[PDB]
Structure formats: C-alpha cells, structure tokens
Scaffold this active site. Structure first.
Site, PDB file in Angstrom:
ATOM      1  N   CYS B  42      -6.913  22.221  -1.301  1.00 28.67           N
ATOM      2  CA  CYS B  42      -6.050  21.148  -0.818  1.00 28.67           C
ATOM      3  C   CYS B  42      -6.022  21.085   0.706  1.00 28.67           C
ATOM      4  O   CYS B  42      -5.976  19.994   1.288  1.00 28.67           O
ATOM      5  CB  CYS B  42      -4.644  21.344  -1.378  1.00 28.67           C
ATOM      6  SG  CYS B  42      -3.438  20.068  -1.023  1.00 28.67           S
ATOM      7  N   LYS B  51      -6.292  12.778   3.438  1.00 27.15           N
ATOM      8  CA  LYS B  51      -5.128  12.021   3.883  1.00 27.15           C
ATOM      9  C   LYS B  51      -5.227  11.689   5.366  1.00 27.15           C
ATOM     10  O   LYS B  51      -4.845  10.590   5.788  1.00 27.15           O
ATOM     11  CB  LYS B  51      -3.848  12.811   3.587  1.00 27.15           C
ATOM     12  CG  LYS B  51      -3.019  12.307   2.398  1.00 27.15           C
ATOM     13  CD  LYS B  51      -3.880  11.793   1.246  1.00 27.15           C
ATOM     14  CE  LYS B  51      -4.353  12.893   0.321  1.00 27.15           C
ATOM     15  NZ  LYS B  51      -5.393  12.403  -0.642  1.00 27.15           N
ATOM     16  N   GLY B 181     -18.571   7.752  -9.901  1.00 27.91           N
ATOM     17  CA  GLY B 181     -17.314   8.118 -10.526  1.00 27.91           C
ATOM     18  C   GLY B 181     -16.141   7.405  -9.886  1.00 27.91           C
ATOM     19  O   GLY B 181     -15.972   7.450  -8.662  1.00 27.91           O
ATOM     20  N   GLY B 182     -15.281   6.810 -10.710  1.00 28.85           N
ATOM     21  CA  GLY B 182     -14.164   6.016 -10.233  1.00 28.85           C
ATOM     22  C   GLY B 182     -12.879   6.810 -10.208  1.00 28.85           C
ATOM     23  O   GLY B 182     -11.796   6.276 -10.458  1.00 28.85           O
ATOM     24  N   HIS B 322       0.748  19.782  -6.297  1.00 28.40           N
ATOM     25  CA  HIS B 322       2.113  20.160  -6.643  1.00 28.40           C
ATOM     26  C   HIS B 322       2.220  20.721  -8.058  1.00 28.40           C
ATOM     27  O   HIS B 322       3.210  21.394  -8.373  1.00 28.40           O
ATOM     28  CB  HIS B 322       3.057  18.976  -6.463  1.00 28.40           C
ATOM     29  CG  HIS B 322       2.594  17.722  -7.132  1.00 28.40           C
ATOM     30  ND1 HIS B 322       1.481  17.025  -6.719  1.00 28.40           N
ATOM     31  CD2 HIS B 322       3.098  17.038  -8.186  1.00 28.40           C
ATOM     32  CE1 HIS B 322       1.318  15.963  -7.486  1.00 28.40           C
ATOM     33  NE2 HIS B 322       2.286  15.948  -8.386  1.00 28.40           N
ATOM     34  N   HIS B 445      18.560  -2.682   1.096  1.00 28.99           N
ATOM     35  CA  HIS B 445      17.919  -3.954   1.367  1.00 28.99           C
ATOM     36  C   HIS B 445      17.698  -4.120   2.864  1.00 28.99           C
ATOM     37  O   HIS B 445      18.632  -3.911   3.650  1.00 28.99           O
ATOM     38  CB  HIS B 445      18.767  -5.113   0.829  1.00 28.99           C
ATOM     39  CG  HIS B 445      18.170  -6.461   1.083  1.00 28.99           C
ATOM     40  ND1 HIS B 445      17.462  -7.155   0.125  1.00 28.99           N
ATOM     41  CD2 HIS B 445      18.192  -7.254   2.179  1.00 28.99           C
ATOM     42  CE1 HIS B 445      17.062  -8.309   0.626  1.00 28.99           C
ATOM     43  NE2 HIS B 445      17.495  -8.395   1.869  1.00 28.99           N
TER      44      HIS B 445
END
Ligand SMILES: Cc1cc2nc3c(=O)[nH]c(=O)nc-3n(C[C@H](O)[C@H](O)[C@H](O)COP(=O)(O)OP(=O)(O)OC[C@H]3O[C@@H](n4cnc5c(N)ncnc54)[C@H](O)[C@@H]3O)c2cc1C
Ligand SMILES: Cc1cc2nc3c(=O)[nH]c(=O)nc-3n(C[C@H](O)[C@H](O)[C@H](O)COP(=O)(O)OP(=O)(O)OC[C@H]3O[C@@H](n4cnc5c(N)ncnc54)[C@H](O)[C@@H]3O)c2cc1C
Ligand SMILES: [Cl-]
Ligand SMILES: [Cl-]
Ligand SMILES: [Zn+2]
Ligand SMILES: [Zn+2]
Lengths: 467, 467
Positions: B42, B51, B181-182, B322, B445
């Site tokens: 990772c 990332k 590969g998807g 995780h 909101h």
C-alpha cells in the site's frame, strides 16, 4: 378569490422544500416570492454563489502555488474576474430553473409578488406594477428568511462599502479588502479574494473568529487562514467607515483603547444576519415577534395564531439552510397530523473555507459550562497518508465523549472535505454511538475519514494506531 | 536466541497495525520485512503512490479543460513527468518515516530480511548478504501480502510490458497505453495517464468494468470514463501480448469471434492480485494453503497450526488496505483474550477515479441472486447545487433497502468525494439504519452528502424533495 390549503411566504430553502412536502402530503399549496426568481437568499445571493467563487479561487490558488511541485509547467496564472462571476451567475440560473421544475412537477402554484397578511386566512399578493390579488389559505407557513445586518454608522454604497450581495459581483480583484465583522460570510469571501491576489484584513470586535463553534476550531481556523495570508485585527471596536474616492478608511479602538486605522479599496460588512419581516402584515394577522425581531414559535413551530407557522431564518435557532429545510418538512408533516421531531443538537454547521470546518453536537465550552465530565480525542490531518498525497494537510479532528458511558457528545473537524466528513458524525450521534463504536468500524484507507476513526480511538482509550 | 510474544512477518498495513495493537496490549512484539523500507504494498507500490499521481493528474486535467470556464487564464499546461514521480516518491518517503516513528514509539523490534519458518515457534531471518538469526515467538501473524497477477503467455519486462509497480515510475507520458483488465488498479492508473495526454484502451474479458461492485457503479463509471476519453474493449479475451521493439501488440478475440489487434507503446497488466507466500517456509511449520494459494483461516483468522494467524491480502476476503488493518487489530485483540468481531459485509470499497466510486453492503445483483425483496433509491449528483457550483456533476447515489423493514442493505456511490461520503453509509448500516432514518437526519447544505439524504427519501417512499 383563489383558495389553497397551505400558503408559503418565501421561496428560500425552507420555503420551497416546505411547499414540496405539503404537496407530497396532498395539500393544495401555493408559494409566494417577491424576487424575480425562486430560491431565496441561499441560491441568489448566498450559499451557491459563495461555493462557486470558492471553488474557482481554490483552483487558482493551486495553480499559483502548487502546480510546480505537482509537476505541471505553466506560466503565472491570471484572473479573468468577469468569467468567474459570469460562470457563477450561470450556476445560479441553473439552480433557479431546477427549482421552477420542482414546483411544476409537484403542482405548486407559484405567485410572484410581495405577500402581506390581510387576516389570519387572507394574504394580499402585490405584483411589481403595484396591482394586488387576495388569496385564501387555511394554513400559512412564514418563510421570509433574513437580510444582512449592518452597523448604523456605515453608509453602504453597493460599490466599495458593500455587503456579501455586491461582494459576489465585483468587477475587479480588490487590492486590499477589509472585512468588518466576524460573520462566516466574511471569512468565506475573504478566502475567495485572498486566493485571487487581494490583501485581506478582518477587523472584528469579537475575541476569536467563528466564536459559536468549538474553541479548537476557532484556534485552528485562524492559524491556517493566517498561514494563507489573511490578517486579523480582533477585539477591535469600529467607530467609522469612510469612502474617499477609491479608498475606504476604517477607524476603531483596540482592546487597550488605542486608535486603529485600516485603509483598503473595498470594504465588506459581515456582521451577521437579521430576520426579515418587513411588509409581511403580521399586525393584520395577529402574529407576535420576540425582542430580537423573530417570529415567536412553540414546540411545533407554531405562532400564537394557531394556523400560522414559521420556519427558517425568521425564527430562533441556527441560521442555516438545512435547518430551514428540516423545519419546513417538520411543519408540513405536522399539518398532515403526523408527529415529527427535530433534534437541533444534531444539526451540523459548516464553514466552506479550505480546509473546510464543520461541527456537530456540543462544544467543549458547552460541556464545561454544564459541568459534564468529558473525554477528548484528537488526531491531526497531517498524519493521514491521504493528506500527504494531496498536500491538503491542515487541520485536526476532535471528538468529545462522556467519560462514564463513552457516548460521543460532539465532533469538531477542520480539514480537507470536512463539509462532507461531518455527515458520519451526524449519523453516529443520531444512533448515540460511543467513541469505541466508531473506533471499531471500518474506514476506507486511504481517506480523510480515517482521522475520525483515529480520533475515536484516542477518545475511547488513548489507543490510536497512527499517532 | 531472543524471545517474543508475537512476531509479525510483513510490514504492510495489516502487518504494522497488528504490531502496534499487539504492543498496546502489552505483548513483546517484533516485525520482519524483506523490503528496504516499511509500508508494504500500500505504501511503496500501492495506495499512496497511485493516490499521489491521481491528485497530480486531476490538477492537470482542470488546467487543460476547465480553467478557462473557471476564469483562470493560462496557456496550454505541460507535464513535467520527472517532477510528478519525484513528488510521489517524496510522499512515500514521508509516510515511511512515519511508520518508523510508530514502530519506535510502540517499542516494536524491527528486523530487515526474509522471514522463514523453522518450526511453529522459531523463525529464521535471512538478510541480503546471507547472515541469519533465529527468533522465538509464542505467536506469529502471517501478513506477507500479495503480488501482481499475470497471464501465462505474458512476459513482463519491467519496461513496456509492466505491472502497477513500474507504471507508477514511468519516465515519459505514454502515447497509447493499453490496460489489460478493468480492475480498480487498471482504471485508476489508466485515468492518471489519460489526463496527462495518453490514449488509453482498456481490454477486459468480462462485459463490464469493476465487476466486483454494483452493476450501476460499473455502468456509470464506464459512462464517465468514456466521456473523459478512455476507450473500452469489453467482452474481449486476450490470447497474446508480444513486445515488438518500441510497440506492444495485444491480440484477442471479440464476442463475435472476430480477430482484434491493439497496438500501443505501453501495456499495463491489471488482471488482479495474488497472495504472496514465497520463501515463507510454511511447509517447515505445517501451515496449509487453499487451492488459490491463500493461507487457510477459520473464524478467528487462525490457521490449522493453532498459534499462527494470518491477515490481509494473503488470506480470504477483499484485498483492501483497511481490511488488512482491521484483521490485524482482530488477531491482536484475539491473542489478548478479548472477543472482537469483523463484519465483512460492512467493509467499504473505493475506486479513486474522478468522480470517485464507493460501495458498501450488498450489491443489487447479490440481492437478486438471494431473492431478497428490496426497494431502490437513486438521486443524481448533477441535481445538487454543490455539484453545479464545482462542475463535478457526474454520478449517482444508489441506496438499497429491504421492502418489509426499510433497513438499508447497501449503498453505492459514484460522485465527488465518494471516497469519504461512504463513511456515512458504513456507520449507518453498522447501526442497522432504515432508509427513513437517513432521510430524516440533518445533512449540511450545500454538500454532496445531500444526495445520500435524497436517495434515502427515494428508497423509503419515492418521496425525494429535489428530484
Ligand atoms: C453569502 C451567504 C452565504 C451563505 N452560505 C451558507 C452556507 O454555505 N450554508 C448554509 O447553510 N447557509 C448559508 N447561508 C445562509 C442561508 O442563505 C440561509 O440560512 C437560508 O437561505 C435560510 O433560508 P430561508 O428559507 O429561511 O429564507 P431565505 O433564503 O432568506 O429567503 C426567504 C425568501 O422570502 C422572500 N420574501 C420575504 N418577504 C416576503 C414577502 N413578504 N412576500 C414574498 N416573498 C417574501 C425573499 O425574497 C426570500 O427569497 C449563507 C448566506 C449568505 C448571505
Ligand atoms: C497500485 C495499487 C493500488 C492500490 N490501492 C489501494 C487503495 O486505494 N485502497 C486499498 O484499500 N487497497 C489498495 N490496494 C491494495 C493494498 O495495497 C493492499 O490491500 C494492502 O497493502 C494489504 O497489505 P497487507 O498488509 O495485507 O500486505 P502487503 O502490504 O501486500 O505487503 C506485506 C509485506 O510483507 C513483505 N513480505 C512478504 N513475505 C515476506 C517474508 N517471508 N519475509 C519478510 N517480509 C515479507 C512484503 O515485502 C510486503 O512489503 C492497491 C494495490 C495496488 C498494487
Ligand atoms: Cl492513517
Ligand atoms: Cl439538494
Ligand atoms: Zn489506515
Ligand atoms: Zn438542501
């Protein structure tokens, strides 16, 4: 005379959501709006405009300061303010059309004009040309919202001595923007123009920014905003704001009593929001206000006149858009004979700066004043692998828990995406979750929400893993 | 020969979190890693590196396609590919030091070398030069992780016919990248280079991308990735991948049996990940594997040898970071005599494309295969004011609820900030929340989480407000 079951005066988020819920429950419903378009403060001069300018300015901030580190080769970025404002205007026009669409879909009659009470059951609707029509409504929901507060000695000119309304429509990036007042709006719009090149000085009588939130958030927000270039003159009592051509001069005294002078080319007054009832004809229906100018309501958001209700910024409680939305749904379901409930302790509050700020539940100051025995858990955002990858490393997550039962009493966030991370805490507190409960739940890795999981581990037993 | 209570083979997220949790409970803990630095897949070649590149490439995408609409004036942005990778490497180096800090803070012994079993209580640690030490441990947690899978006819060369490890370190932006590969990995790395200017063609044997997730997410992700420029060759069985100098030729057949040929200058093999046990000496300890090569486990993640446990990508379950972390905490607490529980139905899965994709719980396909009577709620992201403001309007929130009890059975998201919104759904399902429950909870909101509230309203009684 036309007849309706429910009339809604005001087309803000509280108003038009209430109307939809009344239409869904089977009422013949009408909504009245004095503005040319529907949507209220939040859409036309409020939430949506600010978020649009915040999103564009944050893009500009990255391009100016982080693109080289990110490996993106560009020249010095320049601001086309007319395109920024224009795009924001299109966003507002987009949302207005959606609200029109919702009104037609729910078969709600939309009347343009000023609604004033003739009695507890008759409402006069005056159009722009001055003509009037009177309608009949069994029940009425007051949703007239709020207007900007100001200070009596300030002469607003809609050019350089302005409120948020005009600040959202500037024709140039200010050289030095002065913000008078500690409202959230000032900090948000100050962030917009700080990013776009302005010098921003916040001059405020209060002793800390966003004082209604948890003190840690107050501390961390001022810390990060200073790091971004914003200047703060706190505990300072303004006594004058003069416009001298292209310059505004703000005169004040500091906490030691000494004179203070601040000069800029634009001055934004953000001293709060005030409930709006002008021209509503409340005397002709018998509805009472309180000493603060708000419509008095009871547990069911009911006025002293039993068939008239009131929601949103025009009544007591946090002046938030989703608070008005919930109260609108509350009244509609109450009118339908149901027994709904609003938990005002679980209504979140969000500040849309970057990092975002969000809180729900009790603050630590509230727990201290009540003599509640509480634990604190706290995990820093900079320790997250997700934050290291994105460079959005500012902030902290803070959880307050009951010392005996471990029940979470308040969650307070400042960090990336806090405006949406806060929803986890809201749902958690709705189910009366303990710090241990949240600490044992899977949180996707790598995400910013892992900071919530780590803080919960810290609160439940000082046994966080990544700290 | 030193003695420890627990030894952990592997420094992945499962490995090092287990060690910290063991140290917190009072065990003498040692951790062994064959790699030069800590972090596992990772950190060094997985979550964090990808990332980081996803964040950098998305910035480049904005500068190229949205800045002009945003009112930001720049010339055509150019990619400094060496700087992108260098910054990513620095983020990895940042996190590695943090793990080193956590090991020392928790007083965990760190040994570099290949860990191999001599018996159920002795472990040999072989360094690179050949030196060895034997350690004794009452318990051992296998956390050896995974390696990239491949196809028997594929000859990986670490240059142009590469896995995820090498794609994260490319020295140039590909002219045409072929992705075999998807999977989550392939779509993420394809997005990185698509934004940077590459042509990206995804070849997948199944009829849909990310097939392990809800069918709606599969459809909407392909719909948006195509809109972003990605090309897809689905229902396509690859039978050959040959490198012809500076070009790779992938030969396959389509659903009609007709021959198909795709040529690019880079080919990424993303056909999944496989459990890694090479050199672990399981035969010398007696630990059995299953047919897929994973360490067999029971209800307590216990192998057939009672004192040895196994976690993470080397055991059954979703190969998620995780998931390894939680299983590490589970084994550690189990060793301490406590009775923890892992709810594998409530472990979320995230795809870090833009929009992000996240799901938790049962998929619709699973509910159909089990014959469960369910309701569907669905709200589109383009209808949110927050999405209109940021121009991140793609995607949908989908909620599945039981027809009799209204209990939420699964939440499936594609949209902005889905990687962090999913946390609300996880906590909701952990407390057995109904669709009505979420629909009545305050949502800030304007935020993206309002689509969750609206979808819940649609699921509970087809009574969403803004749709
Ligand atoms: C710049 C700015 C940013 C903000 N950002 C946020 C944010 O991010 N989040 C948040 O939650 N809140 C935010 N707010 C606050 C938010 O706008 C309000 O809390 C929310 O709009 C509450 O609205 P409401 O339905 O009670 O009434 P309002 O939105 O205030 O509007 C009520 C309507 O009633 C109409 N009306 C009044 N009197 C009459 C009459 N007699 N006849 C007919 N029509 C009448 C008015 O024209 C108005 O359209 C912001 C406010 C501002 C100004
Ligand atoms: C490109 C990519 C992107 C990914 N993105 C995500 C994501 O966003 N989110 C997510 O949840 N997952 C993601 N994953 C998967 C994630 O990396 C794994 O699920 C996670 O690392 C599980 O790690 P672990 O502890 O089970 O083992 P690992 O992290 O796989 O590795 C354990 C370590 O053990 C070492 N080791 C093995 N055998 C021995 C031995 N005998 N002696 C000593 N050391 C040994 C290995 O060198 C390795 O470093 C991604 C994977 C890849 C490849
Ligand atoms: Cl973390
Ligand atoms: Cl909404
Ligand atoms: Zn983690
Ligand atoms: Zn809303």
């Amino acid at each position: 005379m036309n007849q309706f079951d429910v009339a809604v005066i005001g087309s803000g988020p509280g108003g038009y959501v209430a109307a939809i819920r009344c239409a869904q429950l089977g009422f013949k419903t009408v909504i009245i709006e004095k503005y040319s378009t529907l949507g209220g403060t939040c859409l036309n001069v409020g939430c949506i405009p600010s978020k649009a300018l915040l999103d564009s300015s944050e893009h500009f901030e990255n391009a100016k300061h982080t693109f080289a580190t990110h490996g993106i080769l560009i020249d010095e970025p320049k601001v086309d303010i007319a395109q920024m404002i224009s795009r924001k205007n299109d966003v507002v026009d987009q949302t207005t059309k959606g609200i029109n669409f919702l009104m037609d879909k729910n078969k709600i009659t939309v009347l343009q004009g000023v609604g004033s009470f003739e009695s507890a059951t008759q409402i006069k609707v005056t159009k722009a040309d001055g003509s009037s029509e009177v309608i009949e409504a069994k029940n009425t929901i007051i949703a007239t919202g709020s207007k900007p507060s100001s200070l009596p000695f300030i002469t607003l000119d809609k050019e350089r001595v302005i409120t948020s309304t005009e600040a959202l429509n500037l024709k140039e990036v200010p050289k030095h923007l002065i913000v008078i007042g500690g409202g959230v709006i000032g900090l948000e719009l100050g962030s917009v123009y700080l990013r776009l090149g302005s010098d921003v000085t916040v001059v405020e009588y209060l002793d800390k920014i966003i004082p209604g939130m948890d003190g840690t958030l107050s501390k961390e927000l001022q810390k990060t905003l200073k790091k971004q270039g914003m200047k703060f003159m706190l505990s300072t009592a303004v006594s004058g704001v003069e416009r001298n051509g292209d310059t505004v001069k703000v005169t004040a005294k500091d906490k030691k009593g000494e004179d203070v002078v601040v000069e800029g080319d634009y001055c934004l007054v953000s001293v709060g929001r005030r409930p709006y009832t002008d021209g509503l004809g409340l005397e002709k229906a018998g509805v009472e206000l309180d000493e603060r100018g708000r419509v008095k309501t009871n547990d069911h958001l009911q006025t002293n006149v039993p068939n008239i209700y009131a929601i949103g910024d025009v009544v007591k409680g946090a002046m938030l858009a989703h608070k008005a939305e919930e109260e609108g749904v509350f009244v509609a379901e109450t009118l339908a004979g149901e027994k709904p409930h609003v938990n005002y302790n679980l209504i979140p509050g969000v500040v849309y700066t970057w990092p975002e700020v969000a809180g729900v539940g009790k603050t630590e100051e509230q727990l201290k004043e009540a003599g509640v025995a509480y634990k604190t858990g706290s995990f820093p955002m900079r320790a997250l692998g997700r934050s290291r990858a994105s460079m959005d490393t500012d902030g902290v997550i803070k959880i307050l828990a009951d010392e005996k039962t471990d029940e979470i009493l308040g969650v307070h966030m400042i960090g990336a995406r806090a405006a949406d991370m806060i929803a986890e805490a809201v749902v958690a507190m709705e189910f009366r979750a303990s710090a241990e409960d949240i600490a044992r739940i899977s949180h996707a890795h790598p995400t910013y929400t892992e900071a919530i999981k780590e803080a919960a581990l810290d609160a439940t037993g000082k046994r966080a893993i990544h700290m």
